[PDB]
Structure 1
Amino acid sequence: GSDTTITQNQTGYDNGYFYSFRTDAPGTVSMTLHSGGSYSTSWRNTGLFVAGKGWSTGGRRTVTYNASFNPSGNARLTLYGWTRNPLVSYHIVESWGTYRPTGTYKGTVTTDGGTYDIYETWRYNAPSIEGTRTYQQFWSVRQQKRTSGTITIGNHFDAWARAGMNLGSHDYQIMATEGYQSSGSSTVSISEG
């Protein structure tokens, strides 16, 4: 009598949190929306998807999350978001499945008890929140996997800026489960503080 499960691309507000669900493989992945800042995902022989809860306008907020993260294959557990002007997507990657994400290495930041490698990558004529675009992606990837704890997001944005990785005006910001050509499940809860 109350959680909702979705299977079609959409964004909105559920139980007081913004959420986004997107896939290029409809029918292979779903998202179940729980109370507060929590949700689950389940996926089976999927294509690409990203799903999560958080805020429709991101910023430097310190956040705390807890997750069950059970990928069989390539997947990430990430504080993920976008800016515009310039258009950039960013990923603060707390855990991953078979593959650890990398890109052009730009240093490290030590925050919330862990050390993260910083990377930049580019996407050329690729999908984005503004349609097909060429744009940058910024990454902080933890040196060891974690599935709960605090992310002082402003420390990542400051570290990126010291490496020349400049953000624009914030669009959404979510604690996401990202998957590629894998199966698995997650349950993720996020809140500020």
Structure 2
Amino acid sequence: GSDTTITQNQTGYDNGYFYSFWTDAPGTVSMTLHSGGSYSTSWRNTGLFLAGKGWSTGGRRTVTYNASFNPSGNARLTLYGWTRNPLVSYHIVESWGTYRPTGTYKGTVTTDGGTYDIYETWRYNRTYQQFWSVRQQKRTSGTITIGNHFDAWARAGMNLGSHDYQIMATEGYQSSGSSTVSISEGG
């Protein structure tokens, strides 16, 4: 009597947190919205998807998360978000499945007990930049001092625009799996 499961692309507010769900393979992935900043996903022989909870306006907030992250194949556990003017997406990748994301290497940032590799890539069709911090070892719970990532990106010339949403996301490309992720502000 309460949690909600969704299967169609949408954004909204659930239990006081912003959420977003997107796939290009409807019918192969779902998201279940739990109390607070928590959700689960389940996917089976999927295409591309990204789902998560967080905030409709991102910023430098320190956040803490805990996750169960159960990919068969290619998936990521990521603090993900977007800006406009310029249009940029960014991913702070905490864990990954069979593939570890990479791009043009621009340095490292050491924050929250770990060292992350910094990368830049571009997406083509709008063409825009994607920024990455990818931890050098996987983890599935801890604190992300988001401002440290933003500052390290800026030192490398990777400049952000005005923030749109910011979520602790599960991302997948093919294969199958599940996750349960909880996020909140604070150290």
TM-score class normalised by the smaller sequence? over 0.9
The CA distance in 2 between the partners of 1:102 and 1:182, in whole Å, is 20
The CA distance in 2 between the partners of 1:124 and 1:24, in whole Å, is 17
Q: CA deviation at 1:109?
A: 0.1
The CA distance in 2 between the partners of 1:123 and 1:110, in whole Å, is 26
How large is the Cα RMSD of the aligned pairs?
0.4
Q: CA deviation at 1:161?
A: 0.1
**Structure 2 gap segments, 5+ residues each:** none
Is 1:81 matched with 2:106? Answer: no
Q: CA deviation at 1:142?
A: 0.1
3-state SS of paired residue (1:58): coil
Which stretches of structure 1, 4 residues or longer, exceed 4 Å deviation after superposition?
Answer: none
The CA distance in 2 between the partners of 1:75 and 1:29, in whole Å, is 13
Report what 1:8 is aligned to.
8
The CA distance in 2 between the partners of 1:30 and 1:181, in whole Å, is 14
The CA distance in 1 between the partners of 2:79 and 2:144, in whole Å, is 8
The CA distance in 1 between the partners of 2:13 and 2:168, in whole Å, is 14
Q: CA deviation at 1:51?
A: 0.1
The CA distance in 1 between the partners of 2:47 and 2:31, in whole Å, is 15
Paired residues, number: 186
Report what 1:19 is aligned to.
19
The CA distance in 2 between the partners of 1:88 and 1:182, in whole Å, is 27
Deviations 1:137-171 (A, max 9, x none): 00000000000000000000000000000000000
Q: CA deviation at 1:55?
A: 0.1
**Structure 1 gap segments, 5+ residues each:** 126-132
Deviations 1:24-48 (A, max 9, x none): 0000000000000000000000000
The CA distance in 2 between the partners of 1:108 and 1:158, in whole Å, is 11
3-state SS of paired residue (1:186): strand
Q: CA deviation at 1:182?
A: 1.8
Report what 1:29 is aligned to.
29
Q: TM-score, normalised by structure 2?
A: 0.99
Is 1:190 matched with 2:183? Answer: yes
Deviations 1:80-115 (A, max 9, x none): 000000000000000000000000000000000000
Report what 1:181 is aligned to.
174
Alignment of 1:49-88 (within 5 A): 49-88=49-88
3-state SS of paired residue (1:161): helix
Report what 1:121 is aligned to.
121
Alignment of 1:23-172 (within 5 A): 23-125=23-125, 133-172=126-165
Q: CA deviation at 1:124?
A: 1.2
Report what 1:129 is aligned to.
none
The CA distance in 2 between the partners of 1:162 and 1:109, in whole Å, is 10
The CA distance in 2 between the partners of 1:153 and 1:123, in whole Å, is 23
